Amino acid sequence: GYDRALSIFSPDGHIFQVEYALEAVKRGTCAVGVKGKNCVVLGCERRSTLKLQDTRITPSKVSKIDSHVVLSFSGLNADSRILIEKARVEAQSHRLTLEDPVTVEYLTRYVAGVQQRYTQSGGVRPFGVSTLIAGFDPRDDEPKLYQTEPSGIYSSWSAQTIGRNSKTVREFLEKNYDRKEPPATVEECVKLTVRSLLEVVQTGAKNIEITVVKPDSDIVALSSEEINQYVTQIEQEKQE
């Protein structure tokens, strides 16, 4: 079997294949996660270079791992499917053996472990993918939001963004997100997430996707018109 060590150290102590995997994430469409007091919202960018697209059947950017946890990503689309599949299998395996669904932290730790493994295994390259994993632990009302990256490090975030121009939207979130008082309602959280994407997106038409996750497996994706109403209200307040 093909055993070649592709991920190796360089004289300055860097693993370039892992660092170049991050450059693939930088190229990917922007993704953002914001947690309120009783919800988490995942926002995603859709590049409008592709029209004549069939939006019914085209792979959506946010994926359910279980009924209570969701995963979005920035980077190589094909790579992300492999992580999503593995995560979904592990979620069902956890329910089968422990008789309890995965915690958000556990699911994150698993996906991050798979990513790490691909940075020191022979014959494989790292995943060119960073993920945002969000949801609520079983029988718990505290919102959860985690991030992973190609190296395999992971951590919890009050709010976070990944992908292209993520430096700009992180700048926005760092000045607009207050920890002492997070977005108290679904409306406030969605509004802040749409606002953060409008710093980068271009047109507020079919370029913004929003998914709201609430406790007790209550997950819904907002439609074009519902998002368009947020886009309208934001700019009308801005004209002042």
Added chain:
Amino acid sequence: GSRRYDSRTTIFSPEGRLYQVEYALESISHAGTAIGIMASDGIVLAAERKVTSTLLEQDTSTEKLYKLNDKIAVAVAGLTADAEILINTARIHAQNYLKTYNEDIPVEILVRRLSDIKQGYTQHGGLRPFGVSFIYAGYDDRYGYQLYTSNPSGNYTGWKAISVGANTSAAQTLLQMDYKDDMKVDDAIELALKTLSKTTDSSALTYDRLEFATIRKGANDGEVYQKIFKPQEIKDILVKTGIT
């Protein structure tokens, strides 16, 4: 030892691109143009054979359009031999699903499976990727008529109308201009042929340089029919649409 001669087919560039995937896509850009158009009452698949000869036996020839099952077909752009490897795998996958669940495989599930196979060749094994892009035309009872494409990266996307192979930039602009959502199969047939006629590198578009196929619910009542067009039938539709 052997390391000396390893090209390392599954590595990132400094910019975060997969060298071999990008170069395979360059190969595919020289292949004959294939077009897919989705209508309300069916799907059209049209494709251009590459600079043929008068001595080529056309009626027994197949390089572009392949049947995966009774409900799903593909148009090929790239290395034909590479495509046939993947096609046979997809045919087996469809039958595995049918044996397991006693239902015809949904179109996306088949497309995802083939795309995942392509993905694997970019991440592990140290082998070159498949130099193939597919257009999938298919029907199932969940989403109805569906058009997809997949490329050597293993990424796939859904489309109302799409082109692969040569002159896709020019072809996609022409499709984007004349396509409408309430369009019918007969109109889509005309659009596909008109687009190929304008984008072709050949002097004129003739029956011997084309492969054509439709997927219609124009099958008596509540069922779907695949029609791979014969050479004479391509000749007739060229006269009907006013190209020859």
Added chain:
Amino acid sequence: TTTLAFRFQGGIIVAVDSRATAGNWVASQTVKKVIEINPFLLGTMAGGAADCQFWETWLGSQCRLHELREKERISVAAASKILSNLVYQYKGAGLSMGTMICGYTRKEGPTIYYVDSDGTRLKGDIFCVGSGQTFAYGVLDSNYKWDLSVEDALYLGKRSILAAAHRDAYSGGSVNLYHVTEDGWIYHGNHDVGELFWKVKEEEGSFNNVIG
């Protein structure tokens, strides 16, 4: 052998006998048939002595690894299922095991799982396993209530083993008692059946068939 375990208001009572036989030959009267998996979990020994000892000690190692990795006490459900899934892999090879995995957690409350070498895993309120199980069930069924005090429940478990020890030839020696609370199990001593029988006879007025 006679082992029992039952759920009640104040947690779980576990009671076992102490005898081990090789045919008619009494090899031991001092066998520990309650396995202390960890400070919060107990398991009972019936069927194969080695099979129960080995795999329930192993179970404790797996439960310890779980709480290191997850930073949280393992559920009785998850602990019992690790053992049942393990023995199910060995099914047909000749393992002999009939055990009650007993614990008390926040999310579950007091919980008992009957786990068995042919793959069975049953949640329940009252379980009795061994050659003297039928004798113990009689005393249990006719005297059991949810609202038993800890004192009365401990006696009921002790008295039920005594009933089995008396009638069943392969049960006896001594009685070991345990009380499982949310904060852990508590050992309630070793009680010689010889001395216990006469004490219970006099104080209770039972066993009038026996001269003392």
Added chain:
Amino acid sequence: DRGVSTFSPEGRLFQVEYSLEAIKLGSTAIGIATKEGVVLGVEKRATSPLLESDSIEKIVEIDRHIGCAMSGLTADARSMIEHARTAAVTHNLYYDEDINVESLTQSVCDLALRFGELMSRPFGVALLIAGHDADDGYQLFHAEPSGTFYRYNAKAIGSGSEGAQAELLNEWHSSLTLKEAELLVLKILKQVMEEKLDENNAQLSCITKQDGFKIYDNEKTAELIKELKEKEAAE
């Protein structure tokens, strides 16, 4: 290119030496061993204020009597911790006892040189392993990706290590109390950290015979930081 297991002309393994450079870029971790216990402390170093700092887990329990702090590519440490936990528990299963701190450290270090063309590269993380056993008492070990481990009275790893080690050279003596060691770790962390030290961007822990391995609450550490500030202002 060149072998992954290649020797340099100086007699050093290229990949091992390069992994040591990755560890120099890592956040600081400090350990101090005393007769009353061993203290472990780390710099958290959050990349952004929106990152919830309590999810940064750079101090980890291996068993009740053994703790561990890390520095470098911290993702690489997860499989090392897993192995260590498994080794500790397995030995207890086989021998009905606690495992010696040295024997645990040796088991972790056996993984280090299992790379070639087994894993594709060395680990890019260094570990401070602290613990207690009956035979050798309170101990602190430094486990490297070379497979070598040294026992230390006190040790610092990461980006501020050589400055911190020079400070530990002067401050450590054989009569240090646990409280004195706690303040000393906090003092030296504060010295080498970029950002200002508080309870949210630094973490303390210890291992004692009585109570075992404990990660300190942010409230507990905050009081020790306030105690440190006052005693430095006292002269």
Added chain:
Amino acid sequence: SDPSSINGGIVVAMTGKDCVAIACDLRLGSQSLGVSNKFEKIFHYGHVFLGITGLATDVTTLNEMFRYKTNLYKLKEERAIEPETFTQLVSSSLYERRFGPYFVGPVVAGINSKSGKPFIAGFDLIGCIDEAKDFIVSGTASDQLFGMCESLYEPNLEPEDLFETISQALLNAADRDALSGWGAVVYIIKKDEVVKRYLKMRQD
């Protein structure tokens, strides 16, 4: 205990003038217990028909297997499989499980689309082909069917006459077998039309 007589059932096939016929009972049982009266044992892949008697799980499994294989055949060959070729595929497929066989008694029936020649064949559980001119029998009442077919059959029967002969062969054989009956179906097969007839019979 004997896998070939747990579920019960029968299949019979006959040739005629420019036609073939294949028929089966509809019973599925668990030994003495009758479970289903709608268990059809005849399947078709294009114009080739396959009857299968024996262990019912294997009957279902083999139908799914030959559907799988004939679908792939068609995609690659760009034509429907013929009875002679399909017969060889059944034989091959059965013999590959020589030392762990499917407990079945398959029967092939069809007309070659090019030559127009009527074709029937039978197999044992490991693939030995029996290519008879006249008739093929299979199942728990195979002895009874041999007796009926051997006396009732004559060559070159017209489609509507052949229907009566095969129907009477099946029915009377099934009525002398505890594990067969509970309904019956007869296929009459010509070069470009196939008729399927359900028979009325005693339900004990």
Added chain:
Amino acid sequence: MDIILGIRVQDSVILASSKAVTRGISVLKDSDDKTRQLSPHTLMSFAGEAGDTVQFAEYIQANIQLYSIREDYELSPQAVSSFVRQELAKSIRSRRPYQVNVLIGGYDKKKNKPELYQIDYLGTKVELPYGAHGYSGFYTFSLLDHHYRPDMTTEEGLDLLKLCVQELEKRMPMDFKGVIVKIVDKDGIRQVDDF
């Protein structure tokens, strides 16, 4: 395990399964639920060898739940029954076969029809208006053959089921400690708590 019954009426499927668990000499439990929900509109009851029954049922449940998440779509009862049959047909030629018999009751939301499938441990599948496993059919089928109509209401189906259980309680030597009854219709799965 012992008695599992099934009946498909006009607009629902009803599954009835015994509550007793016996380990040789003693009845260990009298409230055991011998069923698993595979999807919101599909229920599977089971009976066979100890351990293997629950192991198989939960394994199937996990696989169908995995499919549901991957595709964001509920498989039809027919599709689920075919998947289950293949697993049992695979199992019968294994080193150690699953000795498990099942009934699959589902409501097809596409066709708006209830469906009942009977599958034994060999992988023998049949679609039926009413079915059973083991000796249960020997006592109950003569009553079902007489009274069953395809246009029965759910309430009539339950009454016919009560008559079947009464005959079982009269003529069967074993005490199976009554039955848990569950209904599968367009609105999902619910348990009849008084029977």
Added chain:
Amino acid sequence: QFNPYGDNGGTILGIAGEDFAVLAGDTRNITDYSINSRYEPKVFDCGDNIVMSANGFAADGDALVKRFKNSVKWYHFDHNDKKLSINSAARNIQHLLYGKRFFPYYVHTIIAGLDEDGKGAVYSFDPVGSYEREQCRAGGAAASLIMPFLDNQVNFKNQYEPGTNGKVKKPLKYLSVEEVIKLVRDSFTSATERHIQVGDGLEILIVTKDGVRKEFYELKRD
């Protein structure tokens, strides 16, 4: 058909004192009605103040002891010459035995020594690894002849104080090493009279804080 097992007879006895422990065994090795050896040592010093005997099928017994001695050696190598405690040795032997759960060592194993508080300790194993700490334990051929005697004379079972008539038990007073050896000798002398496989010689290994001492006594050779 080939039978991989055999029976070499023999009887062994382990008794735990207050600050000592003894492990005794007869020296006769047999098959069927023949004597193989009148002196074939059966109790072994395994190092770290632990004595061991694996009675039954002698080939399996020798294999197990040999593997345990090897385990002690490697415990020293792997854990900085740490002394293997009697409880740790016991758990280790469980794993050696259960490792052959489905093709067992056909032996009854007993080990003796001192625990970590200096008190006398004996552990007893079944063929597949189930074990327990015990005060008094006989194994092998004449175990049924010896144990009832020990119940009576060591634990004072069924013995009450004169004058009380069953009301007050005889108190469990501690026995010396000299007193225990007397009971061991009388146990084996009695077993020799009534069991054909017991005889020839008796070898006793005594364990104290000072180390491991041996004593040998002749038994009847018929």
Added chain:
Amino acid sequence: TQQPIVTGTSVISMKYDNGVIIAADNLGSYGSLLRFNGVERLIPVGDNTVVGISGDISDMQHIERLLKDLVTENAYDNPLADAEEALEPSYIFEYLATVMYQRRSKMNPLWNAIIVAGVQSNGDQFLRYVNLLGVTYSSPTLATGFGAHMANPLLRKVVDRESDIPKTTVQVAEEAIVNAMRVLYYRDARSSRNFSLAIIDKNTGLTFKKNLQVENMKWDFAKDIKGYGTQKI
């Protein structure tokens, strides 16, 4: 698992003051057929060890080849192969005993009973037994098969315990062995008159005696024995 086909009967042995003696007859039986009459079942290893084998002859010939290969292997890169690092009886035995127990543990035994007789470097007598089960034991006298039942009782009258060994000369020991071989010839139906005897002495070394015969037999009393009870003639 197998069955023995061509077999060899008793091997007998004992210790004496300065060394050990071992003996075995030259027969290879095929059930009740006395098929092969020139089989050597004592196999010397160097000048200090003799391995006596009974049971299956094909397995004996295999063991014979293992011991031959052992000597070759010991000589490799060993300048002291004929001195301090020569093969000892104890080394040869432990090797065989390992093999026998390993083979029984794979359920494919070498169907033999073996006695290893020799003298160690320090002059100590070595005598130990191993069989198809891997069972081992030592004693002042050792014997296999019929020898265990008939030879041991006779040899134990000369050396009953350890303290009798220094009191037993080589002449007395050989005499006892030779008498035992006669008794076995009288009473074992699978024995022969022809046998081999080997003495390993710490002073005089290895003496290997071939083509020995049982002599001084008593048969004359048979002429007076008539019928089975009442027959006078």
Added chain:
Amino acid sequence: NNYDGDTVTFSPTGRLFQVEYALEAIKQGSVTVGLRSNTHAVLVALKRNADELSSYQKKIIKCDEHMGLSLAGLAPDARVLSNYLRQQCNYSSLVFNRKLAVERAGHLLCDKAQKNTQSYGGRPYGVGLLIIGYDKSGAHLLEFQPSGNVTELYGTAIGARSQGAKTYLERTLDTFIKIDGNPDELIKAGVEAISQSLRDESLTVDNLSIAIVGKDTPFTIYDGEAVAKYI
């Protein structure tokens, strides 16, 4: 240069550079001495610390009751090779009831190290070993190089500045070989030998490591206050 990328490549003058680079790791290692008489064999090793807070890296490893070694170079490689020796010593005892000859132990180490010098993918061992032992032919001292070369000697030294101790032993050859039945005097000679390799630093109580094996002496290691007698 162009021929040092892997162990599978000879240079134009027939040299194996990866092996030579592995040999260089030994020269960087701390000094250790070995010497023997007819009755005893001694190892003396200068242990190296990382700093003043650190412990002194152990240099001597026991392989059996009658055999053991001292190391200089990559310590994990010594652990691998000493583990292999432990196993081979153990196999000899279990299977043949025989203590493994020191010469045969040297042959086994040579062959294990050789396989890593002729195959692609692997690397040579980066450690040198001094093996002492007492077997049936008396006291022995071996020197192992990771090239595969094993040599039997009266005395030697390996590591940094080992040439000083090696010259001293070459002078003292006739004296220390005659030190029979006097373990203390043989260690004294070894301590005096290793002193010829010291610069700036001297032999302290936690610096020095000594091991001995002999006629009626199992392989035992002395550290701490047990070597203060010889300082």
